[PDB]
Scaffold this active site. Sequence first.
Site, PDB file in Angstrom:
ATOM      1  N   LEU A  29      63.611  54.634 126.788  1.00 24.88           N
ATOM      2  CA  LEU A  29      64.696  54.059 126.132  1.00 24.88           C
ATOM      3  C   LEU A  29      64.235  53.591 124.884  1.00 24.88           C
ATOM      4  O   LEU A  29      64.981  53.695 123.844  1.00 24.88           O
ATOM      5  CB  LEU A  29      65.522  53.323 127.022  1.00 24.88           C
ATOM      6  CG  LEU A  29      66.118  54.106 128.183  1.00 24.88           C
ATOM      7  CD1 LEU A  29      66.849  52.801 129.112  1.00 24.88           C
ATOM      8  CD2 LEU A  29      67.375  54.975 127.582  1.00 24.88           C
TER       9      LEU A  29
ATOM     10  N   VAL B 213      60.606  49.806 127.504  1.00 23.40           N
ATOM     11  CA  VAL B 213      61.770  50.016 128.464  1.00 23.40           C
ATOM     12  C   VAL B 213      61.964  51.557 128.737  1.00 23.40           C
ATOM     13  O   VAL B 213      61.884  52.524 127.737  1.00 23.40           O
ATOM     14  CB  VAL B 213      63.172  49.516 127.716  1.00 23.40           C
ATOM     15  CG1 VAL B 213      64.466  49.755 128.695  1.00 23.40           C
ATOM     16  CG2 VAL B 213      63.221  48.031 127.319  1.00 23.40           C
TER      17      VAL B 213
ATOM     18  N   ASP C  68      56.641  31.675 127.723  1.00 18.54           N
ATOM     19  CA  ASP C  68      55.346  31.008 127.344  1.00 18.54           C
ATOM     20  C   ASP C  68      54.224  31.968 127.702  1.00 18.54           C
ATOM     21  O   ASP C  68      53.380  31.934 126.974  1.00 18.54           O
ATOM     22  CB  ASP C  68      55.156  29.766 128.519  1.00 18.54           C
ATOM     23  CG  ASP C  68      56.156  28.688 127.760  1.00 18.54           C
ATOM     24  OD1 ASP C  68      56.948  28.873 127.000  1.00 18.54           O
ATOM     25  OD2 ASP C  68      56.239  27.781 128.638  1.00 18.54           O
TER      26      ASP C  68
ATOM     27  N   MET D 159      67.500  46.649 135.309  1.00 18.75           N
ATOM     28  CA  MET D 159      68.886  46.054 134.747  1.00 18.75           C
ATOM     29  C   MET D 159      69.717  47.387 134.742  1.00 18.75           C
ATOM     30  O   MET D 159      69.336  48.549 134.999  1.00 18.75           O
ATOM     31  CB  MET D 159      69.019  45.399 133.396  1.00 18.75           C
ATOM     32  CG  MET D 159      67.949  44.290 133.562  1.00 18.75           C
ATOM     33  SD  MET D 159      68.365  43.442 132.021  1.00 18.75           S
ATOM     34  CE  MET D 159      69.769  42.646 132.365  1.00 18.75           C
ATOM     35  N   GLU D 160      71.000  47.346 134.482  1.00 15.73           N
ATOM     36  CA  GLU D 160      71.827  48.316 134.393  1.00 15.73           C
ATOM     37  C   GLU D 160      71.746  49.248 133.168  1.00 15.73           C
ATOM     38  O   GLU D 160      71.263  48.663 132.183  1.00 15.73           O
ATOM     39  CB  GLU D 160      73.449  47.628 134.297  1.00 15.73           C
ATOM     40  CG  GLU D 160      74.631  48.709 133.446  1.00 15.73           C
ATOM     41  CD  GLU D 160      75.866  48.039 133.569  1.00 15.73           C
ATOM     42  OE1 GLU D 160      75.886  46.583 133.116  1.00 15.73           O
ATOM     43  OE2 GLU D 160      76.747  48.528 133.358  1.00 15.73           O
TER      44      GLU D 160
ATOM     45  N   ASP E 234      71.244  47.559 117.412  1.00 17.48           N
ATOM     46  CA  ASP E 234      70.282  48.474 116.509  1.00 17.48           C
ATOM     47  C   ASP E 234      69.727  49.650 116.445  1.00 17.48           C
ATOM     48  O   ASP E 234      69.829  50.245 115.245  1.00 17.48           O
ATOM     49  CB  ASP E 234      68.975  47.515 116.900  1.00 17.48           C
ATOM     50  CG  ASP E 234      67.964  47.633 115.884  1.00 17.48           C
ATOM     51  OD1 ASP E 234      67.124  48.920 115.708  1.00 17.48           O
ATOM     52  OD2 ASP E 234      67.271  46.769 115.260  1.00 17.48           O
TER      53      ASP E 234
ATOM     54  N   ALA F 155      60.909  50.630 122.708  1.00 19.09           N
ATOM     55  CA  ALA F 155      60.368  49.616 122.898  1.00 19.09           C
ATOM     56  C   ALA F 155      61.062  48.401 122.198  1.00 19.09           C
ATOM     57  O   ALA F 155      61.716  48.459 121.356  1.00 19.09           O
ATOM     58  CB  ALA F 155      58.959  49.753 121.925  1.00 19.09           C
TER      59      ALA F 155
ATOM     60  N   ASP G 158      68.865  34.284 121.501  1.00 19.47           N
ATOM     61  CA  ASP G 158      68.105  35.495 120.960  1.00 19.47           C
ATOM     62  C   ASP G 158      69.206  36.446 120.655  1.00 19.47           C
ATOM     63  O   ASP G 158      69.019  37.543 121.090  1.00 19.47           O
ATOM     64  CB  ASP G 158      67.025  35.840 121.642  1.00 19.47           C
ATOM     65  CG  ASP G 158      66.149  36.899 120.754  1.00 19.47           C
ATOM     66  OD1 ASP G 158      66.203  36.829 119.612  1.00 19.47           O
ATOM     67  OD2 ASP G 158      65.336  37.625 121.335  1.00 19.47           O
TER      68      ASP G 158
ATOM     69  N   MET H 205      72.694  51.635 129.918  1.00 21.56           N
ATOM     70  CA  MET H 205      73.583  51.475 129.070  1.00 21.56           C
ATOM     71  C   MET H 205      73.431  52.795 128.115  1.00 21.56           C
ATOM     72  O   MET H 205      72.349  52.706 127.250  1.00 21.56           O
ATOM     73  CB  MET H 205      73.725  50.482 128.294  1.00 21.56           C
ATOM     74  CG  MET H 205      73.913  49.067 129.087  1.00 21.56           C
ATOM     75  SD  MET H 205      75.610  48.808 129.565  1.00 21.56           S
ATOM     76  CE  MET H 205      76.544  48.665 128.162  1.00 21.56           C
TER      77      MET H 205
ATOM     78  N   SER I 127      71.271  50.058 122.115  1.00 24.50           N
ATOM     79  CA  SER I 127      71.678  49.089 121.472  1.00 24.50           C
ATOM     80  C   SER I 127      72.174  49.065 120.439  1.00 24.50           C
ATOM     81  O   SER I 127      72.103  50.425 119.628  1.00 24.50           O
ATOM     82  CB  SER I 127      70.137  48.068 121.160  1.00 24.50           C
ATOM     83  OG  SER I 127      69.438  48.703 120.179  1.00 24.50           O
TER      84      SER I 127
END
Length: 311
Positions: A38, A46, A181, A107-108, A116, A40, A154, A110, A114
């Site tokens: 999907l 991803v 961290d 996760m779900e 972007d 990076a 973010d 989409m 995004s």
Amino acid sequence: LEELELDEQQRKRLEAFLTQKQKVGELKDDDFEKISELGAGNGGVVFKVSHKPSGLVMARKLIHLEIKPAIRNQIIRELQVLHECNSPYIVGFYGAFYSDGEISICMEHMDGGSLDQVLKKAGRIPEQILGKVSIAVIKGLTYLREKHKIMHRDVKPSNILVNSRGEIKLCDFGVSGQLIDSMAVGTRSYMSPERLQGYSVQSDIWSMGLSLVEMAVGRYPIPPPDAKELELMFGPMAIFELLDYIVNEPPPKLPSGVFSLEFQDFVNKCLIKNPAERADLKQLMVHAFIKRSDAEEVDFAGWLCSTIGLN
Ligand SMILES: CC(=O)N[C@H]1CC[C@H](Oc2cc(-c3ccncc3Cl)cc3[nH]nc(C)c23)CC1
Ligand SMILES: [Ca+2]
Ligand SMILES: [Ca+2]
Ligand SMILES: [Ca+2]
């Protein structure tokens, strides 16, 4: 709060997600077959994957981290709070696990990517569409603040996901300190001037206003565009120089004549450098631009599918 209420369709989709999620069970690495990449972002790739037992399609983010077993179990425990974040404006969460030196976050999915990725396809995103985007981000930030006392920290176009059903959801909001961290990195070009000077939801509102301007004009708005670039759009600065510009220069704004004054006033109140003067979530929820956009019947799913080529 009235802005946290759900429609009958939204309540149906939320129950259907939890009903399908109950069937999943404990996530294990060998139960996944990769379908496609999907994209990076944020230290990990991803993948669109298929959970072979349940048959569901998920998004799997793999973050390569070499940490002691205790450090990993803490991150996985801290990510469990995402099971309780259920909203039509938050990307659905399935689980997290460690395997072969990589932290996985499932996760779900989409199918719109995004914003972007959508912006690169579209060039720029129309104001009416951005009105729907503003409503979703405001309600998503309000849900995280009201029901979980959580800041996003973010907000940026790559963390706003859309799908072919017309849904607009947030993701990648800070919930695990041990994960941030251990990964020490993400861009700071969307951070508010007060965070770049050494922390409230007001910072997330700045990032929303900055992201809205970038999607409206088709470029990252800092440094501000010259008059020549404007005539080409509507008719290099290093990162340390960029952050110094955010702190020491007036905020960006939409160009005149091409956007409504309500939209211009909305991003202006989001991009006030003083966080005390900057509008909060309650004030933006009743802004003239938001109340106008909520009453506008905009086919976001139809615009999205034809813009990126989904069929
Ligand atoms: C510059 C840029 O735009 N980069 C893209 C790269 C692909 C990525 O796609 C997803 C990421 C996550 C996700 C986010 C945070 N933490 C875990 C995860 Cl799994 C969930 C997702 N669900 N559906 C999709 C399509 C999806 C979005 C950002
Ligand atoms: Ca594997
Ligand atoms: Ca394996
Ligand atoms: Ca991040």
